[PDB]
Design a protein around this ligand. Structure first.
Ligand SMILES: O=c1ccn([C@H]2C[C@H](O)[C@@H](COP(=O)(O)O)O2)c(=O)[nH]1
Ligand SMILES: O=c1ccn([C@H]2C[C@H](O)[C@@H](COP(=O)(O)O)O2)c(=O)[nH]1
Lengths: 316, 316
């Protein structure tokens, strides 16, 4: 069924993860080196065994495809994956005139009063952001995130390159290139960096009329992180093909450190008792074409029937 | 036996390679997406079924480890993998005052007189290079190759970063980082580039006392190219560990386009009738330690017993 390589990747960490400690002094059961693949013409690998919400992956990926490094598009779009790292800057910079909040994040889902106050100090931030444009401009621009990694690779000769888009022209004009790669690792910057990016690299390959893509993820959270990343790069692979008049083929997902967090071995075991239901389909509306012009109405999903959702402490 | 994942990767392309055309209008039987691994503590995966020469991998890798972009070290070292791309520049630039040579490469192993003349026009180049230092400086410096990709990532703020070395300090000081990655893809430059590099990215990971490394190769030649690349990154993995007082673990080799060239399906079939003999061992001399200080005497191999060598037309 399309998501069996996933439960199968979860199994195996449990069963041969050696403990790795990590940045956030929680635990990881870990493996290194895993590649798995999904045939995107049999369905769409949004998991059926654990609800994952696709409106959230859609606003999210699309932000990247527009060049955008600003959370306004996101809040407008009811999205907040990204919320907390702009907040982070705010809550320091001279204007944070208010209260506790510095740290939030932990003292939040393990205490004190921080649950409430803080969620409000965030919201207020988010409401100033969604209108006070001078603010939005200086505290909601995350600067270096996938959208400008992909479309404005700051050169060394004062300019911006549009890797992804550049790459999409090589697909049209010579689709058999062994080198369609978009990178999102900049060695100048990962020192000064907040989360240096996961999906380090990707490559497309066309053959027999089908596009395929391979992702390399330097670090992966089997419970919380991977459910959603498999869907960002499958949607990207559907997206790039419908623009080049290409028929879809498969997504391959490689992983350096793949790991399960210690506070997740119960919750994982819960989905593991489940049975895959048939995977949904996608419909990507035919008329429109500059992929940079897709907008959330243009990507619709059919027949998604998942098992109810599971909860996790974020561990970090 | 240690190299069975290799014959096994060769098999499978033959048997499910769909034809891909390529830059050099020869053919490829191709697959996309393959990951394979080698446990570096059972032996050293220098193939036993096809002689591969390790003095050539040694001078070669070591050049990279010194920062070096100059062929002098190589010619001194009897190496010439690299020869022909500096030649390439020579044979144009105003001073090429002499003859035919422009193209060489094809009219060479398929005609005319080009076999001889040209091999001499190369040598002469190589003898001017190995003494006339002003020349060596301007026609034997390849500029952007692994040695400066890894140790002088030209920043955008006029300077040089030493990725590899930088990364080797994070191994000592926090060996459990999910992010020890050295990249060798620069989006500014792959436009203006000769062979944009293959081994796009690599990552280390230590755990239980062992270092491991994963390579991502955007493009791979199963007959001619991979035999030697598996040995560059295994030697690197032995090299980085003996410097951090680390015990070795395994090498993983991922591949975007893995392919077999059409002029290679006989020669491949030849090794395929063979049987692996026990894989050799390495000895990396104990006293010395700045890995940047290893020199070819310091890395010795034990008991290498291979099947005689096989010939290939280079196809490109
Ligand atoms: O898109 C994402 C973002 C983060 N993570 C996970 C990976 C690690 O578990 C953690 C990042 O920690 P480092 O890998 O940066 O050390 O968050 C993912 O799985 N996918
Ligand atoms: O270290 C190397 C260098 C080159 N190649 C092969 C890969 C391709 O067959 C060809 C390069 O062609 P492109 O991938 O650049 O198109 O040479 C390798 O296998 N390993």
């Amino acid at each position: 069924m399309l998501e069996q390589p996933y439960l199968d990747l979860a199994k195996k960490v449990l069963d041969e993860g050696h403990f790795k400690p990590d940045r956030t002094h929680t635990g990881t059961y870990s493996i290194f080196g895993h590649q798995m693949r999904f045939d995107l013409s049999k369905g769409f690998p949004l998991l059926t065994t654990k609800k994952v919400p696709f409106g959230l992956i859609k606003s999210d990926l699309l932000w990247f495809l527009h060049g955008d490094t600003n959370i306004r598009f996101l809040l407008q779009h009811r999205n907040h994956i990204w919320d907390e790292w702009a907040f982070e800057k705010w809550v320091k910079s001279d204007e944070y005139h208010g209260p506790d909040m510095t740290d939030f994040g932990h003292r939040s889902q393990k205490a004190p009063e921080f649950a409430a106050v803080y969620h409000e100090e965030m919201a207020k931030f988010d409401d100033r952001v969604l209108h006070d444009d001078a603010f939005a401009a200086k505290y909601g621009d995350l600067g270096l995130v996938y959208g400008s990694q992909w479309r404005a690779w700051h050169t060394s000769k004062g300019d911006t390159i549009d890797q992804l888009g550049d790459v999409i022209e090589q697909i049209k004009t010579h689709p058999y290139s062994r080198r369609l790669i978009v990178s999102a690792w900049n060695p100048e910057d990962v020192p000064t960096m907040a989360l240096p990016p996961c999906h380090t690299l990707y490559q497309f390959y066309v053959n027999d009329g089908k596009l395929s893509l391979q992702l390399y993820q330097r670090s992966a959270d089997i419970f919380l992180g991977v459910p959603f990343n498999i869907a960002s790069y499958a949607l990207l692979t559907h997206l790039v093909a419908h623009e080049c008049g290409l028929e879809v083929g498969e997504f391959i997902h490689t992983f350096g450190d793949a790991h399960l967090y210690v506070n997740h071995l119960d919750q994982i075991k819960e989905q593991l008792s489940r049975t895959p239901r048939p995977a949904p389909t996608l419909q990507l509306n035919p008329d429109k074409h500059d992929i940079f012009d897709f907008d959330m109405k243009d990507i619709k999903l059919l027949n998604y029937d998942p098992y109810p959702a599971i909860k996790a402490p974020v561990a970090v």
